[PDB]
C-alpha cells in the first residue's frame, strides 16, 4: 500500500453548503489544507487514503474572520489589574473563528506591536490564520520599524494600522497626523501586497466620524481603506456610519456591544438603509473580558430573530471581511481557497471546525489547543 497521507485528503459529503452562497447539498474535497473541489456527489474514492466525513443533515459554511481581537490581551483602563489575558486558540476555534486580525487598544505602554506580532505568528503555527494592525489608539503610531508605512510594507503579518478618534482615550490627533498615518498604511500596503487599511476605534464624541471626513478632505487615501469600528456604540454615530457606508465606505459593527444598537440590529439597519452586505463587517473586540460567543450568536439572531437567510447572515463574518482586507483564499468555499470550514446543525450550532484542512473542533469542543492551554 502506497502512502498518500501527506495530502491529508478529506471529503466532506452530504452537507447543505453555504459558501456563503447557498449551494444546496454539495460535497467539498480537501487536500493540503486547500479546497480542491466543490461539487455534488464527489466519489468517495476519487482520491486515495481519503478521510470521508458524513455531513448529511448538517450545514457547511466558511470559517469566521474576526478582524478586531486583542490577541495578546488588552484592557488596563482601570489600572494594571484590568489588563486582560492573551487569547487562547481554543476560544477562537470553538467560536468558529479560523482567521483573525489582532490589534492593540488604549494601552500601548505595557502592550507592544512586537508582542502582537509574535502571538499572531504563534496562532499561525498552531493552525489558524492571523494578521495584525500596527499602531494602537495613540497617534502618531507606535510602530515596529519606526514608520507606519514601513511596518505595513515589510512586516509580513501587518496589513494596516489602527488608531482612535472621537474618544476620551484618544491622543487628540489632528487631521495631518491622521491623514499621514492613513496614507502611510495605504502606500505601505501597495508595497507589501497588504490591503493597507486604517481602522478607527470610534468613541462617543459628538464629532463622531468628522475626523475621517476631514482626513478625506486632506489626502487621497481611498474611502475603501478607512474602517470605522464600534459604530453601534451610540445612535448618532451609527447613523453617520450608515451614511459613510452609503458613500462607498465599509463599516465594522462590534458584536460585543448590545446597546444602544445590538450587532444583529445594526446589520439589519444597514440592509434596511440599502447598504450592500459587502460593506458591512462584524468583529468581536475579543479579549478587550469580551469573548467570541457573540459572533455566532449574531448570525443565529439574524436568521432566527430577524429574517436574514443563512447566506446573508454569514457575509459580515466571512466574504465581507475577506473582501475588505483582501484576504486571498478566505471567506468563501471555492476550489483553490483555504479549507477553513465550519460544520453546524440546522440550528447553526457549531459541531466541527476545520482550519486549513485540519480538524480543530470535533463535538463543539476544541481537540486542538494552544501549547499552554
Ligand atoms: Zn476599540
Ligand atoms: Zn479593540
Curated annotation (Swiss-Prot):
Binding positions (Zn(2+) 1): 68, 70, 162, 285
Record PTM text: Carboxylation allows a single lysine to coordinate two zinc ions.
One GO CC term on file: cytoplasm
Binding site for Zn(2+) 2: 162, 201, 230
Cofactor note: Binds 2 Zn(2+) ions per subunit. Has highest activity with Zn(2+) ions, but is also active with Co(2+) ions.
Subcellular location, record wording: Cytoplasm
Activity modulation notes: P-hydroxymercuribenzoate causes a slight inhibition (8 to 17 %). Iodoacetamide, o-iodosobenzoate and ammonium persulfate do not inhibit the enzyme activity.
A GO MF label: metallopeptidase activity
Cofactor: Zn(2+); Co(2+)
Effect noted on mutating residue 169 to M: Loss of activity
Binding site for substrate: 75-77, 106, 137, 169, 233
Active site: residue positions: 285 (proton acceptor)
Main location per the UniProt record: cytoplasm
Resulting phenotype, residue 233 to M: Loss of activity
UniProt modified residues of type N6-carboxylysine: 162
Impact when changing residue 169 to K: Reduces activity 1000-fold
Gene Ontology process terms (BP): proteolysis
Manganese in keyword set: no
Keywords of this entry: Cobalt, Cytoplasm, Hydrolase, Metal-binding, Metalloprotease, Protease, Zinc
Pfam families for this protein: Amidohydro_1
Enzyme Commission designation: 3.4.19.-
Family to which this protein belongs: Belongs to the peptidase M38 family.
General function of this protein: Catalyzes the hydrolytic cleavage of a subset of L-isoaspartyl (L-beta-aspartyl) dipeptides. Used to degrade proteins damaged by L-isoaspartyl residues formation. The best substrate for the enzyme reported thus far is iso-Asp-Leu.
Protein name stated in the entry: Isoaspartyl dipeptidase
Gene: iadA
Amino acid at each position: 500500500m502506497i502512502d498518500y497521507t501527506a495530502a491529508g485528503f478529506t471529503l466532506l459529503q452530504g452537507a447543505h453548503l453555504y459558501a456563503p452562497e447557498d449551494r444546496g447539498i454539495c460535497d467539498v474535497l480537501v487536500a493540503n489544507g486547500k479546497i480542491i473541489a466543490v461539487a455534488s456527489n464527489i466519489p468517495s474514492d476519487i482520491v486515495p487514503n481519503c478521510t470521508v466525513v458524513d455531513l448529511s443533515g448538517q450545514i457547511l459554511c466558511p470559517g469566521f474572520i474576526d478582524q478586531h481581537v486583542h490577541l495578546i490581551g488588552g484592557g488596563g483602563e482601570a489600572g494594571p489589574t484590568t489588563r486582560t489575558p492573551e487569547v487562547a486558540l481554543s476560544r477562537l476555534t470553538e467560536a468558529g473563528v479560523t482567521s483573525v486580525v489582532g490589534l492593540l487598544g488604549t494601552d500601548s505602554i505595557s502592550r507592544h506591536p512586537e508582542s502582537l506580532l509574535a502571538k499572531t505568528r504563534a496562532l499561525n503555527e498552531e493552525g489558524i490564520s492571523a494578521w495584525m494592525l500596527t499602531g494602537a489608539y495613540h497617534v502618531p503610531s507606535r510602530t515596529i520599524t519606526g514608520s507606519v508605512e514601513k511596518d505595513v510594507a515589510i512586516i509580513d503579518r501587518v496589513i494596516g494600522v489602527k488608531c482612535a478618534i472621537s474618544d476620551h482615550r484618544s491622543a487628540a490627533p489632528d487631521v495631518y497626523h491622521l491623514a499621514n498615518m492613513a496614507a502611510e498604511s495605504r502606500v505601505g500596503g501597495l508595497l507589501g501586497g497588504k490591503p493597507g487599511v486604517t481602522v478607527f476605534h470610534m468613541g462617543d464624541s459628538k464629532k463622531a466620524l468628522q475626523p475621517i471626513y476631514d482626513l478625506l478632505e486632506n489626502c487621497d487615501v481611498p474611502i475603501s481603506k478607512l474602517l470605522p469600528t464600534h459604530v453601534n456604540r451610540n445612535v448618532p454615530l451609527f447613523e453617520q456610519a450608515l451614511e459613510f457606508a452609503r458613500k462607498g465606505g465599509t463599516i465594522d459593527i462590534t458584536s460585543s456591544i448590545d446597546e444602544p444598537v445590538a450587532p444583529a440590529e445594526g446589520i439589519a439597519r444597514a440592509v434596511q438603509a440599502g447598504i450592500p452586505l459587502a460593506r458591512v463587517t462584524l468583529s468581536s473586540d475579543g479579549n478587550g473580558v469580551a469573548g467570541f460567543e457573540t459572533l455566532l450568536e449574531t448570525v443565529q439572531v439574524l436568521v432566527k430573530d430577524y429574517d436574514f437567510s443563512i447566506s446573508d447572515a454569514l457575509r459580515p463574518l466571512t466574504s465581507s471581511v475577506a473582501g475588505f482586507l483582501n484576504l486571498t483564499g478566505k471567506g468563501e468555499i471555492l476550489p483553490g481557497n483555504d479549507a477553513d470550514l465550519l460544520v453546524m446543525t440546522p440550528e447553526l450550532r457549531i459541531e466541527q471546525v476545520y482550519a486549513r484542512g485540519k480538524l480543530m473542533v470535533k463535538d463543539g469542543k476544541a481537540c486542538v489547543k494552544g501549547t499552554f492551554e
